[PDB]
Design a protein around this motif. Structure first.
Motif, short mmCIF file in Angstrom:
data_model
loop_
_atom_site.label_atom_id
_atom_site.label_comp_id
_atom_site.label_asym_id
_atom_site.label_seq_id
_atom_site.Cartn_x
_atom_site.Cartn_y
_atom_site.Cartn_z
N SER A 1 -4.69 0.97 2.54
CA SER A 1 -5.87 0.30 3.25
C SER A 1 -5.95 0.90 4.43
O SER A 1 -5.24 1.30 5.43
CB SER A 1 -5.40 -1.17 3.26
N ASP B 1 0.87 -1.33 -0.06
CA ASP B 1 0.09 -0.20 0.04
C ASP B 1 0.94 1.30 0.01
O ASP B 1 0.70 2.17 -0.77
CB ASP B 1 -0.89 -0.04 1.05
N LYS C 1 -6.80 -0.78 7.23
CA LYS C 1 -5.90 -1.31 8.23
C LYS C 1 -4.60 -0.99 8.66
O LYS C 1 -4.08 -0.81 9.50
CB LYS C 1 -5.92 -3.01 7.90
#
Lengths: 226, 51
Positions: free
Chosen positions: A218, A139, A220
Motif C-alpha cells: 500500500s 502488505d 501509505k
C-alpha cells in the motif's frame, strides 16, 4: 488434546498443541480398524478416518466464555510427497492452512525448508494486523510472496532465454530470491526471530526493488517504511 | 535500414556517375580487371541474442 482442553479452558491460558507424525497416527488407526474385522477403506486407511481425524483436530479454537485458546500445528508426514494421499487430503479439509516443508529446499540446504509458494494460512488476515504484529505485515507478506513467485519464474526463465535478456524486474528478482532463500527462509536451528525482527528483515529484502516496483504494498505503508 | 539503403544506393550511384563523368569513361572495365583479389570480406559471428 485433553491436556490442552484442561489448561486452555478450565484454566485461562493459551496453548499451542503440536502433534507429530499424523501419518503414524493414521497408521495406528489403520492397525486398530483392521484389528477388528472392518474392511480397509480408500487406501487401507479406514473410511471413517475423516471423522477420526476431525475429532482430533477440531478440539481447538477460541471460545466465547474462556480467555484461553488451543492452536494446533499438526506435524504431518506426506508419504511419497503426494498431497492427494488420504491423510494430507483429510487434514487439508479439516484444518485451516498448510505449511509445506520442501524436499528441494532441504536438499539445497535451506533450514528450515519451508517453501512459501504452496504454503498458506487461511486465517492469516485475522492475525496480521494493526493491533497484532506490525501494521505493515499484511502488505509485506503479500509483496514478499509475489516477489518470490516472480523470482522463481525468473530463475526458470534464465536457463532458457539467457540471463541478460531478462527484464529489470526479473533481474532484480533473481537477486531477491537468492538473498531471500539464503537469508530470510534460511534460519539457524536456535535462532529465534520476533515477528517484528522478521518484518525488519523482510523490509531489508524488499529494499532491493525501487519504491515504484513494490506493487502490492500500500502507498501509505511505502511512505511510512522504506 | 531498408530506407537507409534506399538513400545510400542513390547517393553512391550519383557519386559514381559524377566520377565517371569527370574521368570521361566508365570505370567498369578497370573495376572488372581489378577483381583478382577481394578487399572487403564478411566474417560470421555467432552472437548470442536471447536464447
Amino acid at each position: 488434546l485433553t491436556t490442552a482442553e484442561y489448561l486452555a479452558y478450565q484454566t485461562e491460558r493459551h496453548v499451542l498443541t503440536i502433534l507429530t507424525d499424523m501419518s503414524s497416527y493414521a497408521d495406528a488407526l489403520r492397525e486398530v480398524s483392521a484389528a477388528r474385522e472392518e474392511v480397509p477403506g480408500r487406501r487401507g486407511y479406514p473410511g471413517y478416518m475423516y471423522t477420526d481425524l476431525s475429532t482430533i483436530y477440531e478440539r481447538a479454537g477460541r471460545v466465547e466464555g474462556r480467555n484461553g485458546s488451543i492452536t494446533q500445528i499438526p506435524i504431518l508426514t506426506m508419504p511419497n510427497d503426494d498431497i492427494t494421499h488420504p491423510i494430507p487430503d483429510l487434514t487439508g479439509y479439516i484444518t485451516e492452512g498448510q505449511i509445506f516443508v520442501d524436499r528441494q529446499l532441504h536438499n539445497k540446504g535451506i533450514y528450515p525448508p519451508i517453501n512459501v509458494l504452496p504454503s498458506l494460512s487461511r486465517l492469516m488476515k485475522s492475525a496480521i494486523g494493526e493491533g497484532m504484529t506490525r501494521k505493515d505485515h499484511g502488505d509485506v507478506s503479500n509483496q514478499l510472496y509475489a516477489k518470490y513467485a516472480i523470482g522463481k519464474d525468473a530463475a526458470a526463465m534464465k536457463a532458457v532465454v539467457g540471463e541478460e535478456a531478462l527484464s529489470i524486474e526479473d533481474k532484480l528478482s533473481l537477486e531477491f530470491l537468492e538473498k531471500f532463500e539464503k537469508t530470510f527462509i534460511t534460519q539457524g536451528a536456535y535462532e529465534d526471530r520476533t515477528v517484528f525482527e522478521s518484518l525488519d528483515q523482510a523490509w531489508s529484502l524488499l529494499r532491493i526493488y525501487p519504491k515504484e516496483m513494490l506493487n502490492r504494498i500500500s502507498p501509505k505503508i511505502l511512505d511510512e517504511f522504506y | 535500414a531498408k530506407q537507409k539503403m534506399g538513400r545510400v544506393m542513390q547517393t553512391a550511384a550519383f557519386s559514381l556517375a559524377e566520377v565517371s563523368y569527370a574521368t570521361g569513361e566508365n570505370i567498369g572495365y578497370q573495376v572488372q580487371e581489378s577483381v583478382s583479389t577481394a578487399r572487403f570480406k564478411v566474417r560470421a559471428r555467432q552472437e548470442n541474442v536471447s536464447g
